[PDB]
Short mmCIF file of C-alpha atoms and ligand atoms in Angstrom, two decimals:
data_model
loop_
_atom_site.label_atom_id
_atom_site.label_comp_id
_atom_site.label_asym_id
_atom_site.label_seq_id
_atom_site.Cartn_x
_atom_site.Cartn_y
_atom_site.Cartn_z
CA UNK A 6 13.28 11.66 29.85
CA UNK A 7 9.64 12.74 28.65
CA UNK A 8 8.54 13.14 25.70
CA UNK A 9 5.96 15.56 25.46
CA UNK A 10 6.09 19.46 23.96
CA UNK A 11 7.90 22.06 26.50
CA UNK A 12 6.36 24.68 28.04
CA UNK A 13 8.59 28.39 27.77
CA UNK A 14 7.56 31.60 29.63
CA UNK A 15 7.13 34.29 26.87
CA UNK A 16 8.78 32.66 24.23
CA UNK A 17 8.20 34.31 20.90
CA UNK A 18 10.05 32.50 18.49
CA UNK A 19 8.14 29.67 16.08
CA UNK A 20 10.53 27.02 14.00
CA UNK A 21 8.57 24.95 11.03
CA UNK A 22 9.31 22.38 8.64
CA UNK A 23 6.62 22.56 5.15
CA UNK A 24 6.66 20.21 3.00
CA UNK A 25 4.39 19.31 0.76
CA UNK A 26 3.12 17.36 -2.59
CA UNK A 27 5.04 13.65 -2.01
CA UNK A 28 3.30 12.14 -4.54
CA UNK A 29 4.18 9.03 -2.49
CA UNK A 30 3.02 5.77 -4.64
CA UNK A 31 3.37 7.16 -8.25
CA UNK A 32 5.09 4.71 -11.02
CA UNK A 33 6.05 7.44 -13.89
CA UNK A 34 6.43 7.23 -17.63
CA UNK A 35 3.83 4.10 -18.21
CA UNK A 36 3.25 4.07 -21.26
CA UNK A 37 6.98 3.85 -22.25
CA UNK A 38 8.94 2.46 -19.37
CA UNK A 39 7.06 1.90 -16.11
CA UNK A 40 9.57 3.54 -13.20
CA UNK A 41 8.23 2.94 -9.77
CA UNK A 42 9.28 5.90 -7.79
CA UNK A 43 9.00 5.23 -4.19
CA UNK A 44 12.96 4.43 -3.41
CA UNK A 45 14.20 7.44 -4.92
CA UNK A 46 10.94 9.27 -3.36
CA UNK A 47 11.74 7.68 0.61
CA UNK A 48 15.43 8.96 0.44
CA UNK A 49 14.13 12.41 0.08
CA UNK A 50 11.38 11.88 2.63
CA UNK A 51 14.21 10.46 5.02
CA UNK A 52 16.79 13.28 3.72
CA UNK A 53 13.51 15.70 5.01
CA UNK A 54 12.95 14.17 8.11
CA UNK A 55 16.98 13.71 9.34
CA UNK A 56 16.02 17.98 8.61
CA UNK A 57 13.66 18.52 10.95
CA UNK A 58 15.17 16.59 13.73
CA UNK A 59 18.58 18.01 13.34
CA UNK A 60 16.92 21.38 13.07
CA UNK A 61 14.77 20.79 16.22
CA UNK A 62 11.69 22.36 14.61
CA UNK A 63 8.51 23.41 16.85
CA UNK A 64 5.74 22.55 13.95
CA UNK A 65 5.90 20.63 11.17
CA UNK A 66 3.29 21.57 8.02
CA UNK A 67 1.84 18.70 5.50
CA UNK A 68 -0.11 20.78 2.66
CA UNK A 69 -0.46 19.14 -1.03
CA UNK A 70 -1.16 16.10 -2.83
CA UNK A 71 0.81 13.77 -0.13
CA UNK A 72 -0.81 10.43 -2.48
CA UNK A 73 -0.11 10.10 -6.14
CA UNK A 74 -3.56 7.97 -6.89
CA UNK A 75 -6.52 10.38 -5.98
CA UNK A 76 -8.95 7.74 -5.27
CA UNK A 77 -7.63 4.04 -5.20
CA UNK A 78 -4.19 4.43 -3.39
CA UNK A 79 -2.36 1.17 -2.81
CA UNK A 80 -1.74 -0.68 0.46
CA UNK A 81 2.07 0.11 -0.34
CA UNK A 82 1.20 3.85 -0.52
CA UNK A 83 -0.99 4.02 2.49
CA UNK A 84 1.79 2.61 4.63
CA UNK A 85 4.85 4.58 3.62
CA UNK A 86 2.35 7.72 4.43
CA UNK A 87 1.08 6.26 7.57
CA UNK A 88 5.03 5.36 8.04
CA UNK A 89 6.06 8.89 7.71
CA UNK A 90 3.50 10.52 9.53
CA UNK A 91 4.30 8.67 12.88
CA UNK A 92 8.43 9.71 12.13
CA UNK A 93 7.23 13.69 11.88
CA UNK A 94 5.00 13.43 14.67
CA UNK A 95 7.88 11.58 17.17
CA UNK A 96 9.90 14.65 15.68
CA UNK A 97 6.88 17.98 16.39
CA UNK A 98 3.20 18.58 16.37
CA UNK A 99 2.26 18.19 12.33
CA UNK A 100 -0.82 19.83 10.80
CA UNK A 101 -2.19 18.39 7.72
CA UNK A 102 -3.68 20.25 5.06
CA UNK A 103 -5.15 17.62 2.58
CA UNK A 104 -5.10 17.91 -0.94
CA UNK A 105 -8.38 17.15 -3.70
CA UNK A 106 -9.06 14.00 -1.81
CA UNK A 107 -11.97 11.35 -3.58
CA UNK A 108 -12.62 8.89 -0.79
CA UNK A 109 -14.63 9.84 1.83
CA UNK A 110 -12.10 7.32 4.49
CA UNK A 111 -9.93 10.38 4.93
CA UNK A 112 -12.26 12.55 6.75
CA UNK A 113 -12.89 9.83 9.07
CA UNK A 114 -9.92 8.87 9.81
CA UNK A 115 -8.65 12.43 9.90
CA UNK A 116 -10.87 13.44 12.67
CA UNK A 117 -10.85 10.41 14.69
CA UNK A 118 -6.88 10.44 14.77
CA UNK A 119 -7.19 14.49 15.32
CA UNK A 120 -9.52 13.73 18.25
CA UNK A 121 -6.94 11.25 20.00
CA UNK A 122 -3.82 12.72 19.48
CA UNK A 123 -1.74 16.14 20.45
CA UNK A 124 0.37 15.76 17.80
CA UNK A 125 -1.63 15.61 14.34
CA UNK A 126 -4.10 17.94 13.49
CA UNK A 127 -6.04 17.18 10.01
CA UNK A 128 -7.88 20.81 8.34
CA UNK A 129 -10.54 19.04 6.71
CA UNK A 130 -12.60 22.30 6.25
CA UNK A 131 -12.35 26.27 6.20
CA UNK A 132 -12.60 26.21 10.08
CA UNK A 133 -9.40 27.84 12.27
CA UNK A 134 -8.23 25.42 14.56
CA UNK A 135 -5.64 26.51 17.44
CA UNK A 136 -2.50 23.74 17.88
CA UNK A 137 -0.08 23.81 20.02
CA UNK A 138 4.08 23.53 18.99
CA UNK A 139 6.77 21.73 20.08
CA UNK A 140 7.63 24.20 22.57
CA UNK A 141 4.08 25.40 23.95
CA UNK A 142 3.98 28.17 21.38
CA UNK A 143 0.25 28.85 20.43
CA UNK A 144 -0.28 28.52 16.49
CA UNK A 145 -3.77 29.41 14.91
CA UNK A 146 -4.40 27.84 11.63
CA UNK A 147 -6.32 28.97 8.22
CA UNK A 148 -7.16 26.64 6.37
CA UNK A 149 -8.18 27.02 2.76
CA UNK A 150 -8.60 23.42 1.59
CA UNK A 151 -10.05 23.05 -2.08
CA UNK A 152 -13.87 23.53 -1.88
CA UNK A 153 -16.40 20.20 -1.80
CA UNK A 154 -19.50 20.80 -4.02
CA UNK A 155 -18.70 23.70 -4.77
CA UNK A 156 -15.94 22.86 -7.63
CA UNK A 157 -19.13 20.72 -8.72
CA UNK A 158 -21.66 22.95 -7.77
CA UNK A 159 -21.55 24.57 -11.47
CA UNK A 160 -22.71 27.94 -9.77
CA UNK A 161 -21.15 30.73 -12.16
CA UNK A 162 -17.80 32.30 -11.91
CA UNK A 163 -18.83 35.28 -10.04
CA UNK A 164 -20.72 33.55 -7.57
CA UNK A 165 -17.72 30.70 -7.20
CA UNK A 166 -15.19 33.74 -7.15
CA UNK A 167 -17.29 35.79 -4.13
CA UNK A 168 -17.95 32.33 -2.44
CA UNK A 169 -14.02 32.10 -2.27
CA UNK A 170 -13.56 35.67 -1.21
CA UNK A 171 -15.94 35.43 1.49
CA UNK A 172 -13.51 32.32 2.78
CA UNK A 173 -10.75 34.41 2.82
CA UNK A 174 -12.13 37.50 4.57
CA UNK A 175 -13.37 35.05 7.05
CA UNK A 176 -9.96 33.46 7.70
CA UNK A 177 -8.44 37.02 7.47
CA UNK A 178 -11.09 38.13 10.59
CA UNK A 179 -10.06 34.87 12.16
CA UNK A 180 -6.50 35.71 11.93
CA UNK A 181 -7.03 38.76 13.62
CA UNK A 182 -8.09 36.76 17.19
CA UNK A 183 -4.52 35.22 16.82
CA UNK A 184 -2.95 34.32 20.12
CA UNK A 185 1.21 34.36 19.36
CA UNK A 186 1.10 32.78 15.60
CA UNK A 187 -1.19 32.16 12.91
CA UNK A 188 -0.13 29.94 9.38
CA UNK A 189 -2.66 30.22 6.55
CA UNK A 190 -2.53 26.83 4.70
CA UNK A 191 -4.16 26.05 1.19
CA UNK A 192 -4.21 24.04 -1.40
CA UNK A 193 -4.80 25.88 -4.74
CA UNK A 194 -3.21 27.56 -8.00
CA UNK A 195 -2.16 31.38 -7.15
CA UNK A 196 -3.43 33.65 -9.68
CA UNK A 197 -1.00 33.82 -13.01
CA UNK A 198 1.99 31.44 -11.73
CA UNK A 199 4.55 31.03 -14.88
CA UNK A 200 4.73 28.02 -15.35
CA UNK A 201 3.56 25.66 -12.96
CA UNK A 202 0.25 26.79 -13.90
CA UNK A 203 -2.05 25.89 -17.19
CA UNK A 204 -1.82 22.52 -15.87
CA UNK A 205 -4.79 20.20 -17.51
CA UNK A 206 -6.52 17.11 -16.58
CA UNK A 207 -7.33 18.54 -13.39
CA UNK A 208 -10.19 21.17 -11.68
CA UNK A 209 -8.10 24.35 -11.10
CA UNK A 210 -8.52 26.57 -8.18
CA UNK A 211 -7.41 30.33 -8.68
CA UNK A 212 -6.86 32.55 -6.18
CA UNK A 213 -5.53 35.85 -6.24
CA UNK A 214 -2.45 36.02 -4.03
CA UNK A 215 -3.22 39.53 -2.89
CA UNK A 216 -6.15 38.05 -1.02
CA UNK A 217 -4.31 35.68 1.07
CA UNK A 218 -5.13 37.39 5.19
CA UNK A 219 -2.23 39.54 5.72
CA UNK A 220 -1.98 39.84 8.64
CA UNK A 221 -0.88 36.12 9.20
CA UNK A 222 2.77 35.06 10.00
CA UNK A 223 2.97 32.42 7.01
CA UNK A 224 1.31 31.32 4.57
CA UNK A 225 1.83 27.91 3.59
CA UNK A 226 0.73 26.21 -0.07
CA UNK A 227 0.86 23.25 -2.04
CA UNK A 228 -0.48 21.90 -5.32
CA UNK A 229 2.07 23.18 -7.33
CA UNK A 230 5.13 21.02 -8.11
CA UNK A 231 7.63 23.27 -8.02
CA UNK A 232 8.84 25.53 -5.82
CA UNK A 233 8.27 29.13 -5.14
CA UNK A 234 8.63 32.13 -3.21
CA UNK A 235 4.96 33.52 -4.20
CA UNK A 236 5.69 36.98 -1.97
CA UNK A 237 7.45 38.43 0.95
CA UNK A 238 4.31 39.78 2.82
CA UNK A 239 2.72 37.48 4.23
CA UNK A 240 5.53 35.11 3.51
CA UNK A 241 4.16 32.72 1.07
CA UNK A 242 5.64 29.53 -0.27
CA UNK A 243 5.01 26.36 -2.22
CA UNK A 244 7.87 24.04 -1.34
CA UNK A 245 7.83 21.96 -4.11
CA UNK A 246 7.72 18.57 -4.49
CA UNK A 247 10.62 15.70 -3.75
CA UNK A 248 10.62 13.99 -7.21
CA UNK A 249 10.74 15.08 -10.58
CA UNK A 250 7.74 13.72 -11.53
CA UNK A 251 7.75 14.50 -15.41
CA UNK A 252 10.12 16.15 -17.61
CA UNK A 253 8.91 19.26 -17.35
CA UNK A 254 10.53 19.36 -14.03
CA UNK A 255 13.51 19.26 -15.46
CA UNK A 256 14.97 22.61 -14.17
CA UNK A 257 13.15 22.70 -10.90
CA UNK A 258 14.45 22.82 -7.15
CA UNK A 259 13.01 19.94 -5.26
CA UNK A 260 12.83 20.15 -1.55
CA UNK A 261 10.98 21.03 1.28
CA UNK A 262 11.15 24.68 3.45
CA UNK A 263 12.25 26.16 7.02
CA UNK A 264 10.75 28.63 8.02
CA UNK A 265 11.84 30.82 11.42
CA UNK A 266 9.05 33.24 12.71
CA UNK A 267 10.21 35.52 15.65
CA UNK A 268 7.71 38.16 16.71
CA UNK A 269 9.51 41.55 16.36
CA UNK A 270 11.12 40.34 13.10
CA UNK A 271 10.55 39.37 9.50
CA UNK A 272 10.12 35.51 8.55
CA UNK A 273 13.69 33.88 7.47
CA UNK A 274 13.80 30.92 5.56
CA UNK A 275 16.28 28.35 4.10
CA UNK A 276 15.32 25.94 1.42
CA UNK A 277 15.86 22.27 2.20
CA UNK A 278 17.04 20.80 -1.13
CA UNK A 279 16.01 16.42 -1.36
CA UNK A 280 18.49 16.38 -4.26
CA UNK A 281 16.24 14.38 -6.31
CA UNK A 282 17.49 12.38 -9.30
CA UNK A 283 17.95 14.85 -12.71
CA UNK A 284 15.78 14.67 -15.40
CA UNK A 285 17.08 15.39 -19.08
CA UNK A 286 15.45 16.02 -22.45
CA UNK A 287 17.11 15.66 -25.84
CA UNK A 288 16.25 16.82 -28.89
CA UNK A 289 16.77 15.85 -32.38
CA UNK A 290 15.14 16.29 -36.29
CA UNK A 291 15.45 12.40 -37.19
CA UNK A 292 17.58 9.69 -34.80
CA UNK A 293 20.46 9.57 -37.39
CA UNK A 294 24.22 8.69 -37.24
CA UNK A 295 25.19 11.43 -34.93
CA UNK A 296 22.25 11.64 -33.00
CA UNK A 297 22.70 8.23 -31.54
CA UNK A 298 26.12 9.08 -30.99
CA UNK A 299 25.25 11.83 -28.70
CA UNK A 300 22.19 10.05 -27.37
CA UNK A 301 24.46 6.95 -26.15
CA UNK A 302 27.29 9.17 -24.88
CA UNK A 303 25.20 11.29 -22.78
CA UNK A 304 23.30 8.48 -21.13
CA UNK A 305 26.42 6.44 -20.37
CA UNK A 306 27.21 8.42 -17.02
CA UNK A 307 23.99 10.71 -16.58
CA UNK A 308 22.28 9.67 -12.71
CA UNK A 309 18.89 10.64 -13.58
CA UNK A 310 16.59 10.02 -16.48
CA UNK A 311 16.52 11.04 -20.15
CA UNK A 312 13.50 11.38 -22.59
CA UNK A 313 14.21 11.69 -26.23
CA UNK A 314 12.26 13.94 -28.19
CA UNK A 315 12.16 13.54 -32.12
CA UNK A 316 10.30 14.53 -35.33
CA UNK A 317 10.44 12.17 -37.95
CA UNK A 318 11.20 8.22 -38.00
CA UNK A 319 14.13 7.54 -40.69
CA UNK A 320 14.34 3.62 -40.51
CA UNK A 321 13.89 0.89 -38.02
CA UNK A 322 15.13 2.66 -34.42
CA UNK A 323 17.81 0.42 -32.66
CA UNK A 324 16.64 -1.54 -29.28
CA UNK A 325 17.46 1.64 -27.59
CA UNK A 326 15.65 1.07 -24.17
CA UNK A 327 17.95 -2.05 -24.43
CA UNK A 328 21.96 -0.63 -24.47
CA UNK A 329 20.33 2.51 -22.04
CA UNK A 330 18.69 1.63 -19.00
CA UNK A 331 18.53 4.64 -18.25
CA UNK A 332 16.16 5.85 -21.26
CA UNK A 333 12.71 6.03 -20.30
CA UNK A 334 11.19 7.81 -22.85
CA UNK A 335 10.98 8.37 -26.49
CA UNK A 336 7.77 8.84 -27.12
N1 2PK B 1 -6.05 13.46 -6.06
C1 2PK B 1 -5.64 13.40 -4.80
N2 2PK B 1 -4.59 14.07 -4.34
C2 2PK B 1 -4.38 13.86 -3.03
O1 2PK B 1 -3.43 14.42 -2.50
C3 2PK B 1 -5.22 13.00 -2.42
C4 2PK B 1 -5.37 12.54 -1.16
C5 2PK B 1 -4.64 12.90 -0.01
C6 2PK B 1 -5.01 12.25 1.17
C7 2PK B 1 -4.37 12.52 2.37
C8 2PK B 1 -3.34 13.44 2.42
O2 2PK B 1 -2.71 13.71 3.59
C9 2PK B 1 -2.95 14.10 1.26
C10 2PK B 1 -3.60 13.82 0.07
S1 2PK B 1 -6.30 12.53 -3.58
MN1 MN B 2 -3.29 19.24 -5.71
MN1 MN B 3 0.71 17.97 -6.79
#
């Protein structure tokens, strides 16, 4: 056949795939037992992917932290992203919404592979950009990517805060000149998020969700690792990300979203679940008689990963990491 988009007469109807926040080359748990992630993290990305086709989906969203290493990510990394971006794109247009990115190669690269292809679109800044779907369907994108000097730029709160406002009324005005669609995308923390938020070693973002345009059909985040329906109006989301990456993703949904837009109606969506290996914390006062009892058992048949968590050393701890392969953590 061909295999270019469509073209529909009046059709009014808008299918997307989000995902977001891969993480893809991260080893976890180093300082206690090194676990290189990307096997368990490419069955999710494939589990996504098999999605989207079988779904036929017009648009496909990238937002989030797609690379684990912020400014040295390795060769290995690099091509598994590289890898996956050319699946999505033989799949629907993808727009990519980069996350706090340190190398200055990604701009470059983003815009030169932009400029020579109709089926990846980087938002490197706060400009709209118009793409077009799988089906000929007109989307206009908002992007909201996290600010360059100004995160740097020291200038107070107040001015930081209206500097960020003024963004978002733009994008909202922009909105307004939609043709068919329009998807906000960002990449920041929404205003008083329990508990993904308070995260440390890293400059925060905050953005009241109440000032997120309106009047667009989605709006599509990342950043945060778990997943969340942020509001109804405009339909907001963080999918989440594939992995557990720590144990405090122990009780989160991992997956990615669909989303179906249809002009007359209210957004639908269906989570995508990756099914991601479990995570599992145990607790204990001292690792006595009992406790490695019920340490040992538990491991035996658990699929996924178990930290211990203790108070007080009482004598010389067994090899433990030894007899439990499966142990990756006891502080
Ligand atoms: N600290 C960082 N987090 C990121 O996601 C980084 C880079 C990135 C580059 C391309 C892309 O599509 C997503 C993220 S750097
Ligand atoms: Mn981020
Ligand atoms: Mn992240």
């Amino acid at each position: 056949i061909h295999h270019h988009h469509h073209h529909v007469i009046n059709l009014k109807e808008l299918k997307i795939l989000h995902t977001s926040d891969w993480h893809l080359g991260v080893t976890s748990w180093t300082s206690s037992r090194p676990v290189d992630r990307r096997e368990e993290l490419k069955k999710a990305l494939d589990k996504v992917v098999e999605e989207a086709e079988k779904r036929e989906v017009d648009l496909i969203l990238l937002t989030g932290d797609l690379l684990h290493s912020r400014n040295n990510p390795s060769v290995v990394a690099l091509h598994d992203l590289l890898d996956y971006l050319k699946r999505m794109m033989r799949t629907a247009p993808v727009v990519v919404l980069p996350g706090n990115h340190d190398w200055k190669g990604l701009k470059l690269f983003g815009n030169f592979v932009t400029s020579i292809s109709s089926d990846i679109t980087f938002v490197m800044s706060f400009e709209p950009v118009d793409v077009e779907a799988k089906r000929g369907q007109k989307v206009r994108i908002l992007p909201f990517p996290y600010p360059d000097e100004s995160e740097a730029l020291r200038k107070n709160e107040g001015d930081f805060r209206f500097f960020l406002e003024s963004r978002l009324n733009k994008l909202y005005e922009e909105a307004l000149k939609k043709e068919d669609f329009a998807i906000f995308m960002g990449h920041f923390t929404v205003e008083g998020l329990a508990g993904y938020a308070g995260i440390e070693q890293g400059r925060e973002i905050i953005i009241n969700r109440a000032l997120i345009p309106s009047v667009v059909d989605y709006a599509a985040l990342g950043h945060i690792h778990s997943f969340r329906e942020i509001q109804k109006q405009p339909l907001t989301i963080y999918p989440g990300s594939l992995i557990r990456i720590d144990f405090g993703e122990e009780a989160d949904e991992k997956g990615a979203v669909f989303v179906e837009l249809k002009r007359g109606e209210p957004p639908r969506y269906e989570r995508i679940d990756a099914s991601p290996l479990p995570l599992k914390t145990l607790y204990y006062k001292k690792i006595d008689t009992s406790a490695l009892k019920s340490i040992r058992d538990f491991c035996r048949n658990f699929p996924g990963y178990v930290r211990v968590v203790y108070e007080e050393d009482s004598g010389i701890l067994p090899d433990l990491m030894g007899e439990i392969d499966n142990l990756v953590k006891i502080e």
